[PDB]
Nucleic acid binder design. Structure first.
Ligand SMILES: Nc1ncnc2c1ncn2[C@@H]1O[C@H](COP(=O)(O)OP(=O)(O)O)[C@@H](O)[C@H]1O
Ligand SMILES: Nc1ncnc2c1ncn2[C@@H]1O[C@H](COP(=O)(O)OP(=O)(O)O)[C@@H](O)[C@H]1O
Ligand SMILES: [K+]
Ligand SMILES: [K+]
Ligand SMILES: [K+]
Ligand SMILES: [K+]
Ligand SMILES: [K+]
Ligand SMILES: [K+]
Ligand SMILES: [K+]
Ligand SMILES: [Mg+2]
Ligand SMILES: [Mg+2]
Ligand SMILES: [Zn+2]
Ligand SMILES: [Zn+2]
Lengths: 531, 531
DNA sequence: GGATCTCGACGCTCTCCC
DNA sequence: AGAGCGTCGAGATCC
């Protein structure tokens, strides 16, 4: 909500030191957007909140000032693997930093305690969990004693959106960080986040007891990324063959990421690509630091070409020259797909974001997110993105980023913008009636229909007992019928029915709520068909 | 082959009449190469043999002299279809000509007989079968009467290669044709042919008793023709879709020819092209004269865009502005492909020769040509042409016309010459060992394998009984495997085994004779692939 | 008559998250 | 336990 352009100077007393720590210590060349302004706000002793996408370079905005200020910097991070992620790079660069989780032994805990009060303990960044602030009586004590000794000067809050309710990813410990700025007022506070709306940001400002605060948000639009949606072949081996052909065609030798829904799927793709001559490796977030360094250094040294990652996992893979991100299966939500695909083309040059749309993936993910009360809705948003053939994909993604998406032209940088066929709207009402006929007949016979059984009964296949008498199967291929059934699902003419078995959660199809709209013979249902 | 440059007039006693008949009677502008010289040797009262490709314009070389001399010219034609074709061309032009076969009615025979001795008879060309000469005494008597009356002066023997028992199909009746030059020595004889085969050319000089005569042959190389080979999709509808796409992309509005292997194939192809918006028309040599005129007037007036014909013996389509000849299936032989594709670009301008190579076409045609003792070898030459991706197609075709093909540079007039692909010899011996393992096991389980069954067992598909225990299916697509199997068949590492059923001939695959060449470890089977 | 493609019925496999 | 997949037998179509 603030204008960072006024802070994009280098004439501050600290700008020389900042530039060198960036070039000779951090081994970087020039600042990414909003980094210099955020750093300049922090070095001036003011609080600042930075909203910036994952993989953008948010961490530097507090790591570099910690090396330009005196003493140490406290970093509130909620999860331990994420900490170790930062710590690896931190003292791989030669920056003495440390960690405090619940499970650290007494040796290290007392060493850290003595180092906070030490005068040239070379330590510059202490990462701690919010429980260490909320539920540790005297961690606060020597925090205050280091403050009085001018050693405690900066606070960095990761995932600041976790402070506010009417928000998601709420960690309750985040209430108690309001003590920090209350007890440490001269210490400058910086909060960083990638998923935050201003309505939540202001609540977090109130919660942290930071009223006057700058708010910089980055342009989430990445014009160098090309968004594309491709059909997912039902055969897994044909799918891997198509992936290998695409990689060898467009991205021969270029580094890339392949996102899979499951860990089994990612291991699966790693070995399959390896057998077909594409050097690949797997990466896991709940990983040992060392094998993280292993997969990372094999990727950087181009020893392997493609990194196979899991959806809610990646969280630390960071390569500037990622030329393509292939989604082996669609993501749980549109925001998740944005943050996942966006890790590509961090060098601001052209990169491709390919997504493979599979009919069965819809119901796998739907069956997986049943416990999330909004999982199905966000998944249907993703499915509607995959089904859309006319709108520019950048606009579709922008629909979920109203506050952080600059209204910029796509410049023919997505498959729909380049697709030079205009479309026409087919009346699909007959197909909906036929599907409802099938579903009601299966309901009468006490039979539950999986999407596959519904499709087969529609095509005159599957169990003869489940077929409606005299229903002529449509003249369209399986894929088109799948898109039609998906469309009916989104418009809620059909609805999902989850059944919980001892082994897994199965998703059947049932007549939807809006189906009664068909009682109107004048009711028309329209779809947009390729030419 | 004689030197025709000395016969390149314009100063002969008949050159005025020749030019007048060419421009005012035949409505032509300029002589095609070797037309002038041949007509001149004929008008000087000498015998001549003309070798010119199908569609070159050979008929004029005997039609024009008959219109400059007095009386009529006898034309020996083996088949009735070519007779009706020439009768069309002559009757439209207002040139009175007639034909007399065994199946001609009584009064028509009487009419021709009375017309021969008639002095004021407007008849200029009498087409007859060699049986009319061999097995008709009354016809020979009328020929004698006309010869002595100075009305019969010229003899034209079409498809003269039929005299020889070495050329393409030999007619026994043609053996008797040697009586003509024996009974009418002052009558000038011209023999026409498209298959040069100079052994055959010395023959039927022997048979016709014309051994001392001029023999002109044309340059078979057509530099304006671009030779290309494309892949035939296994699905027939994708096949027709590709044909429509090619025509609408490259050849909007241009006249074209589509050669099909089977009659029903050509019919189907017309109907499917019409359904897709390409005005098409079918043509068969054994057609009524009226509908042949129908199809030709629809083609000339651009009322139909493409003409689909089956590869029979007797395709007189003969249109000057044929911009593309697409072979829906490969041809039985290389010479056949040349003669068929050569109908393109008769105006000496650029024209395309598209060839659709299908794996199953090999075995249709091999099953069809089992009685021709050399049919399989020539079909394999065709297959070797289709498989070749490096050598210039012009050189490959010219290898079969060594005496009549001038060694001229292609100048990027074929698909392989224009592509700038570097090539690499891949070792494929392991694939041959695997295939031989499969076929040998199928012999062990005492079963015969069709090409489809062998390729399926190679890919781990089809009947489990026919699968090799430990054979891993190759990582290449099915079509690449079709390419490998075709290469092994051509090189005789595999062989065909025909089985005769009550309604068709099946083609199975068995271990080939050269397979034993693998006893040596140093034996390598290389295949040239893109790099 | 045999290959080739469908249908259908029976046995078998597997059970998708971070 | 249920859904889905692979495999084989029986029927239909074609030459
Ligand atoms: N100014 C910059 N120039 C070049 N690379 C940068 C810059 N800032 C950050 N990076 C790189 O981006 C990668 C990911 O940044 P990170 O700090 O993880 O951002 P976030 O915390 O938003 O995920 C890091 O490996 C870092 O080396
Ligand atoms: N000199 C020429 N100029 C223009 N067209 C010609 C010439 N000679 C022949 N043609 C045309 O070529 C077509 C086919 O020739 P044709 O006599 O059938 O040769 P062939 O007997 O070798 O098939 C004829 O329709 C004719 O009109
Ligand atoms: K300022
Ligand atoms: K692209
Ligand atoms: K061309
Ligand atoms: K040549
Ligand atoms: K095949
Ligand atoms: K066959
Ligand atoms: K079926
Ligand atoms: Mg981040
Ligand atoms: Mg001819
Ligand atoms: Zn766009
Ligand atoms: Zn060439």
């Amino acid at each position: 909500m603030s204008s960072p352009a006024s802070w994009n100077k280098e004439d501050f007393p600290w700008s020389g030191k900042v530039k060198d720590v960036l070039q000779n210590v951090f081994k970087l060349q020039k600042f990414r957007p909003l980094q210099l302004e955020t750093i300049n706000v922090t070095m001036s002793g003011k609080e600042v909140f930075l909203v910036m996408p994952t993989g953008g370079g948010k961490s530097l905005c507090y790591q570099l000032p910690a090396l330009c200020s005196d003493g140490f910097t406290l970093v509130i991070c909620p999860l331990i693997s994420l900490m170790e992620d930062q710590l690896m790079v931190l003292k791989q660069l030669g920056i003495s930093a440390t960690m405090l989780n619940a499970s650290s032994p007494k040796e290290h805990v007392k060493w850290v305690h003595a180092e906070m009060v030490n005068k040239n303990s070379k330590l510059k960044l202490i990462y701690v969990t919010p429980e260490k602030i909320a539920k540790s009586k005297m961690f606060m004590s020597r925090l205050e004693k280091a403050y009085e000794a001018r050693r405690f000067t900066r606070i960095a809050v990761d995932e600041v959106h976790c402070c506010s309710q009417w928000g998601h990813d709420f960690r309750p410990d985040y209430k108690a960080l309001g003590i920090l700025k209350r007890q440490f007022p001269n210490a400058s506070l910086i909060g960083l986040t990638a998923t935050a709306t201003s309505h939540v940001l202001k609540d977090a400002q109130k919660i942290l007891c930071v009223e006057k605060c700058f708010t910089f948000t980055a342009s989430f639009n990445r014009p160098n990324l090309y968004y594309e949606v491709r059909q997912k072949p039902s055969n897994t081996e044909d799918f891997i063959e198509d992936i290998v052909k695409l990689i060898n065609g467009r991205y021969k030798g270029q580094s890339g990421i392949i996102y899979c829904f499951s860990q089994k799927d990612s291991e699966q793709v790693t070995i399959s690509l390896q057998k077909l001559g594409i050097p690949a490796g797997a990466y896991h977030a709940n990983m040992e630091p060392e094998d993280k360094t292993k997969v990372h250094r094999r990727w950087a040294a181009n020893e392997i070409q493609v990194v196979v990652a899991t959806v809610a996992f990646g969280m630390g893979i960071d390569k500037p020259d990622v030329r393509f991100v292939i989604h082996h299966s669609m993501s749980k939500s549109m925001e998740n797909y944005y943050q996942e695909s966006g890790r590509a083309g961090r060098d601001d040059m052209k990169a491709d974001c390919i997504l493979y749309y599979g009919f069965g993936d819809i119901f796998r993910i739907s069956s997986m997110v049943v416990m999330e009360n909004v999982g199905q809705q966000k998944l249907y948003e993703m499915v509607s993105y995959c089904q859309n053939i006319n709108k520019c994909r950048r606009v579709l993604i922008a629909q979920h980023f109203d506050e952080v998406w600059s209204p910029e032209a796509c410049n023919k940088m997505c498959d729909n913008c380049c697709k030079e066929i205009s479309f026409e709207r087919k009346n699909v009402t007959a197909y909906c009636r036929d599907l409802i006929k099938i579903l009601k007949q299966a309901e009468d016979l006490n039979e539950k229909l999986t999407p596959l059984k519904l499709i087969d009964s529609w095509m005159g296949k599957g169990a003869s007992k489940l077929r409606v008498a005299g229903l002529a199967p449509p003249t369209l291929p399986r894929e088109d019928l799948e898109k039609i059934i998906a469309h009916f699902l989104i418009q809620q003419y059909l609805k999902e029915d989850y059944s919980f078995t001892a082994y897994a959660t199965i998703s059947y199809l049932k007549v939807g709520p809006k189906a009664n709209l068909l009682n109107n013979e004048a009711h028309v249902i329209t779809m947009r068909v390729k030419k």
